Design an enzyme around this catalytic site. Structure first.
Site, short mmCIF file in Angstrom:
data_model
loop_
_atom_site.label_atom_id
_atom_site.label_comp_id
_atom_site.label_asym_id
_atom_site.label_seq_id
_atom_site.Cartn_x
_atom_site.Cartn_y
_atom_site.Cartn_z
N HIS A 149 0.73 -1.30 0.00
CA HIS A 149 0.00 0.00 0.00
C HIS A 149 0.76 1.36 0.00
O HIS A 149 0.17 2.42 0.29
CB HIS A 149 -1.07 0.01 1.09
CG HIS A 149 -0.54 -0.20 2.48
ND1 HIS A 149 -0.23 -1.45 2.98
CD2 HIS A 149 -0.30 0.68 3.49
CE1 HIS A 149 0.21 -1.34 4.22
NE2 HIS A 149 0.16 -0.05 4.57
N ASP A 151 3.82 2.13 1.76
CA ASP A 151 4.83 2.36 2.80
C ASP A 151 5.73 1.12 2.74
O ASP A 151 5.57 0.30 1.82
CB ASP A 151 4.16 2.66 4.16
CG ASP A 151 3.41 1.44 4.75
OD1 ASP A 151 3.48 0.31 4.22
OD2 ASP A 151 2.72 1.56 5.80
N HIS A 153 -1.23 -1.34 11.63
CA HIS A 153 0.00 -0.73 12.12
C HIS A 153 -0.11 0.80 12.15
O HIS A 153 -0.98 1.40 11.50
CB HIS A 153 1.22 -1.22 11.34
CG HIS A 153 1.13 -1.05 9.85
ND1 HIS A 153 1.44 -2.07 8.98
CD2 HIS A 153 0.85 0.03 9.08
CE1 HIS A 153 1.33 -1.64 7.73
NE2 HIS A 153 0.98 -0.36 7.77
N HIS A 181 -2.77 2.72 9.72
CA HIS A 181 -3.40 1.85 8.72
C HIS A 181 -4.06 0.64 9.34
O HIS A 181 -3.53 0.05 10.29
CB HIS A 181 -2.39 1.44 7.65
CG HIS A 181 -1.60 2.60 7.11
ND1 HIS A 181 -0.30 2.48 6.64
CD2 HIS A 181 -1.90 3.92 7.02
CE1 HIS A 181 0.15 3.67 6.27
NE2 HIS A 181 -0.80 4.56 6.50
N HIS A 190 -5.87 1.05 20.22
CA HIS A 190 -4.50 0.59 20.40
C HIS A 190 -3.52 1.22 19.39
O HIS A 190 -2.37 1.56 19.75
CB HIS A 190 -4.49 -0.95 20.35
CG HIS A 190 -3.13 -1.56 20.24
ND1 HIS A 190 -2.62 -2.42 21.19
CD2 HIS A 190 -2.19 -1.45 19.28
CE1 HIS A 190 -1.41 -2.79 20.82
NE2 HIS A 190 -1.12 -2.22 19.66
N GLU A 191 -3.96 1.38 18.14
CA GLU A 191 -3.20 2.13 17.14
C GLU A 191 -3.01 3.58 17.52
O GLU A 191 -1.96 4.15 17.30
CB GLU A 191 -3.89 2.08 15.77
CG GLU A 191 -3.84 0.71 15.12
CD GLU A 191 -2.55 -0.04 15.43
OE1 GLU A 191 -2.61 -1.08 16.08
OE2 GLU A 191 -1.46 0.39 15.03
N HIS A 247 -0.10 3.99 19.57
CA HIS A 247 1.18 3.92 18.84
C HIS A 247 1.53 5.24 18.17
O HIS A 247 2.68 5.72 18.23
CB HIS A 247 1.09 2.87 17.73
CG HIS A 247 1.52 1.50 18.16
ND1 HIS A 247 2.57 1.28 19.03
CD2 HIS A 247 1.04 0.28 17.83
CE1 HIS A 247 2.72 -0.02 19.20
NE2 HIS A 247 1.81 -0.65 18.49
N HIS A 256 4.50 -1.51 22.68
CA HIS A 256 3.76 -2.69 23.14
C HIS A 256 4.07 -2.91 24.62
O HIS A 256 5.09 -2.44 25.13
CB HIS A 256 4.14 -3.88 22.26
CG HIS A 256 3.31 -3.99 21.02
ND1 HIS A 256 3.63 -4.83 19.97
CD2 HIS A 256 2.17 -3.33 20.66
CE1 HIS A 256 2.72 -4.72 19.02
NE2 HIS A 256 1.82 -3.83 19.40
#
Ligand SMILES: COc1ccc(S(=O)(=O)N(CC(=O)NO)CC(C)C)cc1
Ligand SMILES: COc1ccc(S(=O)(=O)N(CC(=O)NO)CC(C)C)cc1
Ligand SMILES: [Ca+2]
Ligand SMILES: [Ca+2]
Ligand SMILES: [Ca+2]
Ligand SMILES: [Ca+2]
Ligand SMILES: [Ca+2]
Ligand SMILES: [Ca+2]
Ligand SMILES: [Zn+2]
Ligand SMILES: [Zn+2]
Ligand SMILES: [Zn+2]
Ligand SMILES: [Zn+2]
Lengths: 160, 156
Positions: B63, B65, B78, B91, B113-114, B117, B123
């Site tokens: 995609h 990256d 991610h 994404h 959760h993303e 990040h 994590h």
């Protein structure tokens, strides 16, 4: 909607089989599971081959008709419901796991005895060496086995 | 230990998945920001054109990256650590079935959760925590403490 069973004679049904292993090997596996827990309590266990058993045991992939899908290789390995009628008390193994007799894949005996915990009302221990510890633990050995202290305690504080 | 050096951050939902109605998608992500909003002095406002700090979007396999998806299962999404460009972006793997409950993959709780990040969290070794690297990771929900401490150590 129970925390414990109000019987202490329970019935169980292995609803289907995974191909990752013989059915005899699956029954040897799950019969051991039960024994772990039998041993420290006055709970007895009897096997049905049809109908509703208190503990309905099965292998399913991704979506499987309760409201909590499994999720492919890894992530969640199994889930089970606390004591209660119907769905409650049932055991669902993720068959996107590679079940085996030892540690070469995901040990079926050992996910089985922990999940039987959930179905008998046990919640997750915080002790690093408990069966009931949330985290799966390969580094074993297994023909060695014996419940940690925490589990005899956790489970007898439920059925003395 | 990147933090955004701002206190106000824009986001952009660049595209939509077929899995769900638009306002399940918006709703799941708005919610996600609220998790984080309420434990930081960070605020979030949405862009519809331009470059937001946090460009969110769905994709399949390869995609643009250097981090393709892998299909059904294994990686769910991610998201990059704070900074310019691709940084902060998030994404979602659209080989997963995105659901507003646990019937497929719960978008809200992956968003939550993303977003961790993108805001600079990593994590975690605890299992109760949102940032534990594993799904299913209650769908009505409280951030764990170890998450709470973790972001707050970046932003107060
Ligand atoms: C005796 O080994 C167990 C440890 C973890 C699980 S799990 O990975 O499927 N899991 C949920 C729960 O403990 N199942 O009963 C953790 C999950 C929150 C990632 C299953 C059996
Ligand atoms: C609770 O929501 C999280 C979001 C994505 C996944 S992920 O398994 O697909 N994963 C990719 C990345 O870390 N995204 O967060 C971790 C794993 C491949 C290391 C796991 C938990
Ligand atoms: Ca049952
Ligand atoms: Ca799984
Ligand atoms: Ca399997
Ligand atoms: Ca994937
Ligand atoms: Ca960005
Ligand atoms: Ca999809
Ligand atoms: Zn299930
Ligand atoms: Zn468990
Ligand atoms: Zn990407
Ligand atoms: Zn992650």
């Amino acid at each position: 909607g129970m925390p414990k069973w109000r019987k202490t004679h329970l019935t169980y049904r292995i609803v289907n089989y995974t191909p990752d292993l013989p059915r005899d090997a699956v029954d040897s596996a799950i019969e051991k599971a039960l024994k772990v827990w039998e041993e420290v309590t006055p709970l007895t266990f009897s096997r049905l081959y049809e109908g509703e058993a208190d503990i309905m045991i099965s292998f399913a992939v991704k979506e499987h008709g309760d409201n909590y899908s499994f999720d492919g290789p890894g992530h969640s390995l199994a889930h089970a419901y606390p004591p209660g009628p119907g769905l409650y008390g049932d055991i669902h193994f993720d068959d996107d796991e590679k079940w085996t007799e030892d540690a070469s894949g995901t040990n079926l005996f050992l996910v089985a005895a922990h999940e039987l915990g959930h179905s008998l009302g046990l919640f997750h221990s915080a002790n690093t060496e408990a069966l009931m510890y949330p985290l799966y633990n390969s580094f074993t050995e297994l023909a060695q086995f014996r419940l940690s202290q925490d589990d005899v305690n956790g489970i007898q504080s439920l059925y003395g």
